Amino acid sequence: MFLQRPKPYSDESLESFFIRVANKNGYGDVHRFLEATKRFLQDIDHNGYQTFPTDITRINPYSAKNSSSARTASFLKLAQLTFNEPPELLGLAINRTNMKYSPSTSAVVRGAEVFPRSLLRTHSIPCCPLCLRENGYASYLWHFQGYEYCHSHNVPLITTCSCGKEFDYRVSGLKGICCKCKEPITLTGHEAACTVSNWLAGHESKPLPNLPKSYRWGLVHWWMGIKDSEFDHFSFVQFFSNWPRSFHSIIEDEVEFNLEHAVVSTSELRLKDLLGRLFFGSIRLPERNLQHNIILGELLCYLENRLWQDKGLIANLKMNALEATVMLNCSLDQIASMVEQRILKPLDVTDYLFHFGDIFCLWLAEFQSDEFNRSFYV
Template sequence: MFLFTPKSKAYDDEALESYLIRIVNENFFDSYQQLSRAIKDELRELDFEAYGAFPLDLKLLNIYHAKQDSHFRMRAFELLESLLNLPKFELQKLAIFRSYKKINSQSTVNWKGIDFPLSFVRYEGASPYSIPICPECLRDEPYIRQVWHFKHYQACDKHNHNLVEKCPSCNLCINYIANESITHCSCGFELTNTKPFKAPEFKALLSSSMRGKTLDSSNPILNDTPLYQKLSAIAWFQKRYFELDSFDNESIINYFEKWPKNFYQELDEIAKDAELKLIDTFNKTSFTFIFGNLIFSSNLLSEGRSRGHFVWTTVENYLLDLVSKNPKSQKTNIADSLINIAEASAILSTSYEQVYRLYESGTLKAAFRPKIKQKLTTNEGVFFLRQVVELKKSFGDHYSGVYLSKW
């Protein structure tokens, strides 16, 4: 099988699907399916496992779409690189991979070392999302920028114009993957002729921040806060206040502009009204009943990486202050509310297993005596908030996550 090597290498910020479309065009195929069938015929002879993993449909090409055996697809990419005489990993460096990490309990994908919630990607599987474009960028260089695939990226940070979602000629959603054309709509309209419109400042600011640019700002979404923290904070914000598919960039910017004062005020209002909604005394009431899933949802990333995250640090500081302002007395108060093992694990920056050991050693005492041979469940309020927070303070940050060995 002979294929022409593309005249230009892949751009560093190019979408994988965009590069494959350029390869299709330069090799005079009518469609991606023609190329993919030719590649599969070659794979059948050379690597049968990779043959089965290589998709015929362009919308399923990217590695994160592979439900399993993604390494077979990577092997197929390696063969394609050799057929095109491309440098090693030229295709893989453009790919979006599935990640084992979670952001706010959401599945994630990884692009160039950064984890994104999967829900942030504009085109997932067969979902009919528009993939908007910047006509000026296409005039500069006709290829699709990967950031256009991400929902939070709504304005071009280079030209400060809104991304164009619909064709001005036929009003259909622009989707270069479905259309297999980078510069033209399915109706034939040349997208580089689209008149751009200036983007509102909040859209341009967020797009710029998501590209890794920073501002001298107190807003953690715009300043030099690490990108993974910005993305997980946006995921946390959406889950707490909006539907997951809602990307209101103005609300995101405005909310974090007042951070953390606005969040502390919100929590203070909840705490102030807590006694009015009590069914039982505080020491028989779960923390979750009062504050909802505050602790666990704010513990944003798996594997303890949330330690140091500005949202989680804010929650930690609030809990320390809440216990400090509500000292133990004859009458129970909000610091005597009950937290479960998962919440204790988050506060102590340790594993569930370590929390069980702390309980078994008597370091943590249950608020009630469990039945004989009954194991504590992870979602039942069992420890006093006060006790866990004070234990956290006694160990200090330097010893977080290290408590007791199992022998």
Template sequence: MLNPIELYEDESLESCLLRISQNNYYDSFQDFSDEVWFHVKEEDREVRGTFPATLNTVNLYHSHTSSDLKLKALIKIEQWLEINNFPLLKSALSRSSNTFLRQHSAVFRNGVDIPRILLRKNGIPVCPECLKENEYIRQEWHFITHDVCTKHKTDLLHHCPECKTSINYQESENITDCQCGFKFSDHLTPQANSNALLIAQWLNSENTKLANVWGEHQAISSRFGVLLWYINRYNLTDDFSTSFVKYSLNWPTNFYSELDEQIDKAKTVQIKPFNKIFFNEIFNRLLLDCRHLPTREFKTNSILSHIYQYFLSRYQIQPNSGVFSILLSPLEASTLLSCTTDQIYRLYELGFLKLGVRPKLHQKIASHQSVFTLSSIILVKLSNMQSSQDELHHYLSAW
């Protein structure tokens, strides 16, 4: 049996576990972890491994293979607390089967996929005002996308104002105080940067002006997808909030101009004719990087739908421009048509997709081999516009 504590929906698993262990007078999280593990092992002798003794590896996504062991331990704690509905399991970050752009792995919580790369690796900042109200750590403070408190509209505190140490409750096993004795709730944090606040609110599902740009009904996972795509495309590391908000407010005109410039540049520097140029020679990983954001459907992937809109708008003006004879790989084609590469091969066999190069006899086209003309891909998409569904896999009859 354990003394119960109040658990909060937006609390991180590590914070829950730390508070449970402290509320039950364990000297350290390790002592608590050892005891949990001892009982789990007693009940199930087959179970292998150990329950992590440190907070920074306790979450489910840290497991390389199965997280069964950790799940059993969390269920054991829930039994001891006599609580139902698995609040600890719900607060865990598990490994997601989804990925973002270049195979970035994702964690999953409460129906949302979050790129793992956006999780803070070292310190976890806090909001002094939140700690004044309730002494627990919110999950969102673990994300680099959240530099402000959306509730109090203030900056998060990253370093102890007294001794300048990076704040990290997972290491110090102390949520409210620094090791030097400073109480974080005594600190007065400045008003939040308005752009950082806009981003945090948008990612918390609020419909700020960013939602007007990227879609009011856009899923949170897709919002994380847009932001990761932006950070990756423009190679940003730390301060992306101001530039991202500015970028969003000029979307998609700024993006279309960039693509226009890439075509203009190709016209001046390329020595080959367009029908010999690969899509990736002009646009690099433009299509491959929006293949998983984390979906590939136009309705939920606004970057991808705008890329298609861009090519369509240019095609409407100048369908015979040489640009439309550039060559795409099955992977790129399947991204632009939001379908699988198998469906691309099928479309090719049925004669819908045209090859811009002569294939070698009896050789299957490799998924990365640039062979299909851009115009034939646009035409396949256009020929299905009458359909009520906008995704390709609905167009072709089942096979």
């Protein structure tokens, strides 16, 4: 099998890539192209040729249950032999990863952008009938929640055509011709999400900060837990006009509430009981790089400064051997090694034996890194 590469684009999705290859090389559709792709992998002695799907829906590496390792091994072999010039297809596929958010939100990766798994769309993919006729391809941002508006047009994406039927570009082509009435879809102008859709594109909008593509998705899963609802876009804009003093407006509310509503005495207080929501909700977004995770990197500033104010209230919060490992970015064995030789002053892991100012000052002298340290937010 000898193919030709179409016009390359760094923002084209994976499902939009196989459609443009089959239309350029004279194939009928994408279903007959993936069937001939499976036939070529059988002839070249591939290990997972029988697991290659013929559907454009499950062509992504996260849809594979156990054959994910043979999926990109099939993707790497096609880029080296079936084209005159080697394309870039591994950077366009959504790969799984072991990276988690706080407290337990899973995440995936696509090249140099770590996507949240919880913000991935799986029911219906929206699209735009303008970019599919001007750019000639589909954006990779159409598969995720949050990119509700088209970024440089001040229009939303479409979900249902004028005759009651939906349009999905994966099953009905990249032109924009719907299934039932075979017409182009009529469109259905704010700023509250046009600021967001410009910012979730990876681009600059003020006052929202300059961050990598992964670390702008990290604010979105966090801010949904703030409202305890779905994402609100205009309150996202107004919240960072007072950055960080709207986040300073939050932590003042959160320590002053749970001291009132403390059920135990002020010496028997725990870190999870005063600040179990704020501190355990910003650790890995996606990592502990406080140079880009500005949430925890600011949270540390409003924790270190007031430590020994108010009789050392914050610096004396009880902690387990469990949540000592969460803050230090270590394991339970390194806690159990520092109770033998007593670098760390004191085993039951779930019995509250430690203090917060003890664990906070241990990080600053024994457990920093080139990203998770005190010297970026200062």
